[PDB]
Symmetry: D2
Amino acid sequence: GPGAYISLNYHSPTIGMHQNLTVILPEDQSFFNSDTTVKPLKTLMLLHGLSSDETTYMRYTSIERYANEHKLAVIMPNVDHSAYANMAYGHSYYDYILEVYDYVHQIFPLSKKRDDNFIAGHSMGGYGTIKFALTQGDKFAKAVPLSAVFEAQNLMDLEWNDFSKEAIIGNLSSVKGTEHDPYYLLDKAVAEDKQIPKLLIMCGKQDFLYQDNLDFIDYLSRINVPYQFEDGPGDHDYAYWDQAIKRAITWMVND
Amino acid sequence: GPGAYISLNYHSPTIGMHQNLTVILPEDQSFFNSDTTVKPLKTLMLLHGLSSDETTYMRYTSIERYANEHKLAVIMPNVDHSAYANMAYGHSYYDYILEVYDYVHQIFPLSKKRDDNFIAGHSMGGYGTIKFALTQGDKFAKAVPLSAVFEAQNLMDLEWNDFSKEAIIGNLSSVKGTEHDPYYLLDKAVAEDKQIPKLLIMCGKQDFLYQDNLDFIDYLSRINVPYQFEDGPGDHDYAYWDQAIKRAITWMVND
Amino acid sequence: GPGAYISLNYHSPTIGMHQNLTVILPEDQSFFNSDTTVKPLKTLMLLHGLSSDETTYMRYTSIERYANEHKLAVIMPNVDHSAYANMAYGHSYYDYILEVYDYVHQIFPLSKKRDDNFIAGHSMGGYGTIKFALTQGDKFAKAVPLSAVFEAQNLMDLEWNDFSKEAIIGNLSSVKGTEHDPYYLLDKAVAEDKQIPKLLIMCGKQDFLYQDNLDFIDYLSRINVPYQFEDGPGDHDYAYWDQAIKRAITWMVND
Amino acid sequence: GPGAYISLNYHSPTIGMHQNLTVILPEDQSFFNSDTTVKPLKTLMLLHGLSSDETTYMRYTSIERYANEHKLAVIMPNVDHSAYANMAYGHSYYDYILEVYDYVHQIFPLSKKRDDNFIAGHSMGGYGTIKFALTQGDKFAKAVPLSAVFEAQNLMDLEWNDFSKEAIIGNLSSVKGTEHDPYYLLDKAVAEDKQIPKLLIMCGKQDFLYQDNLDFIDYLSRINVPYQFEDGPGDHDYAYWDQAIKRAITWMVND
Ligand SMILES: *C(=O)N1CCCC[C@@H]1c1ccccc1
Ligand SMILES: *C(=O)N1CCCC[C@@H]1c1ccccc1
Ligand SMILES: *C(=O)N1CCCC[C@@H]1c1ccccc1
Ligand SMILES: *C(=O)N1CCCC[C@@H]1c1ccccc1
């Protein structure tokens, strides 16, 4: 089963600039028959890590092959070094992901039902995934952080090439207890009885963030929030993310 | 002002291969608001000439700027050296254009009303435009051949690099009186009382097809088919088609 | 080390039209220092199968990841339904591959040494690979047919979607003894003592072309031409070609 | 004149992320002769304005047609909302432009002589053009600011969609006397007997930056810096920049 690979570049009203976006749209027989109603596809929002962009999942994995097999549309935006935040000094990249979600669901044949919408991503994108899962729980039925950063201070303190902590968080001395802290977002969601998407958290056992993942699922267990955790051999690279996204895609479309 | 520039590559069931396609999709406020119904856009099917492809209108004109002013969606397929024919030895490129039409109208917010759908193209694409206008009149309200080939044997006998006459028409010596002949298609459309689209025919006065164009509008006049004809200085190049397509787009979107 | 992914569209003098080409160019520190001459890279010409195009290796495999690991440049042209032949009724796609080879070696930092240049491909592209291996042996030190068609009459008689046998071979009754026959090309290469590139032949055991590959390597054995043959589980799909190409790239650069 | 349109995406060591870049590469015979030495092309570094990106010159002008006509290679990078600065809280985008210059001169057949290299851009890109002209005068023989901002404080105090002045300049209350201020860069270039490329300054008379351009040219004569200023009807839009780059390209190439 094949599909369409789509590169879109549009002027975003939220971030004030042209920006590239890539979309995988699997083929359906209704797309070629003008007398049939388009039946909308299940949709995955997929978020890249630091130093990656909207092209890197396509280049370094076989994701389109996996998505085609499962009739899953995949949306891959670009957010730079933003950590998926409305940046103190930068762009409103949190709001941007929400605009991308609304835009593709308006212009493409994508289901708008919560049960048909998922979010996933790796490293900074796993951090982004858990932030959206805990603040936009009504938009996604399932969320898949891969090799995620859950202790936000480890992301902000990283000395990554050309990376600016202050652009994201400004003057802030710590992120604990703020909108940047997944532990705070999680306590907030439980306290307000928000829907939390079904969680499949994956991380390779040789990954440097492996302890970070253990600490977070340990906290989830202690506050009685369900999840699936899958580890096994793997490091912090696209060889691991290629295999994990294949497993994640199978899990999201099947129950 | 702003819009989306879209590159699509999908596996076409009609031509049995992956093929690239370009789409210009102007922005509409309904595209960014999940609570409003999408307002479908007026749509232009735009056909390239021989040796061009799906990228060349973008590269050699400012078509996206003009389309954006008038909120006109533009579909630009690729058909190789086919002359928009179901080839004797090749691909079913006539059927391909009908497939592209149904496909983009299924997956994008494009109006399906006849009054909102137009077709245009230059040289071999003007030849294609008049063929679809005279055989698919129920799909297009307006048609704009630019520097078109109306006497088909000029194209079939043209001595262009790597161009194969026989791939298109096979062993046929002449194209007159066949599906490849716009005069025949025209006589059959009038004889069968088919709806024929509103016609704007343009061609520069220094173009080698100028006299070819004069012959065709003279025949249109003798069989009581209306048209508007625009000439003036210009040759067979993108300096002319950049100008001509800007004027054509204003004519299409305005009653 | 991540490198560059490059999409090129240029007007080909050989096939008389614009055509898309994709290139993977791994990073070399000399690319960032204007005062040095570029260290020319090893280069692989990679040929797609029928119904694929210049984007399908990127989309359905992780080839860029594998190429980056081995600092291997990769050239991926598009040749439609041509079977890499100068078509009886169509385009001169055999000559086209030679033009692509000359073009990318002129404009990119690619080694022009025979020992640094390789060719590979699957199905129709493995058939193309073996023809180029046996007719351009001075240009390639290694050749890797994957799931190749070696008995050409099976591809010509294949009834694939919109596939035209006469477009390639015209009025020929059979392909035995012609330029289209790899067995003839092999006998001719041995008879004239042409250099034959180092051969790695791969085919999945569940592939319908498996017996066709066994027949060909048996003939190679009987005329004392060396080769390495790799089978194992796998069918005729990109799941198989994703890791045949990963093994092939390791084999090509490590001699 | 036909040519190559090239999209490149590479992981930049300077800005720590994958980034897209577009390149226009006109044809020369030597690109198709394996036996001739490639003749290096004249090269234009072309800088977009605020809210544009690496695709917008190709989409909203006919620049490739003009460049092909004069055998001019054109490099179009993306620098987001950076104003071509090494940002206080962001990316090292000044250094990035220098990396791009070195990179494309290593991997493409581009002349490294000063007399063959030019720089141009509009609005924020005209501001960028004058900054590189006055700090990298040895890399460029000619520079063309189009509708530029010379009084840098107009750009920093601008109230544009999602635009962050503090990302660029930090706490600075004024830009005067700093690297962001073109008037200081000009006095320092004159003071240090630094080479100033030949200057063609263009601005439409209805452009809101027109008085800002008049002020700069009045200062240029006042201190003996030669220039040509070209005005005429035009506003701050791509309709004007389409003229102006067409005229600008003819001026730089012909000598
Ligand atoms: C993930 O996107 N991050 C970017 C570089 C590699 C992993 C890294 C990270 C490491 C440690 C803490 C947070 C982020
Ligand atoms: C138009 O598509 N054609 C391609 C090459 C230039 C003009 C040419 C044509 C010339 C004369 C008759 C038919 C086509
Ligand atoms: C390979 O490119 N061919 C295209 C379709 C799938 C395999 C097919 C082929 C099958 C049998 C004989 C020849 C070709
Ligand atoms: C140019 O790129 N700038 C972005 C918005 C429109 C013009 C604008 C600018 C205006 C005035 C001063 C500096 C920049």
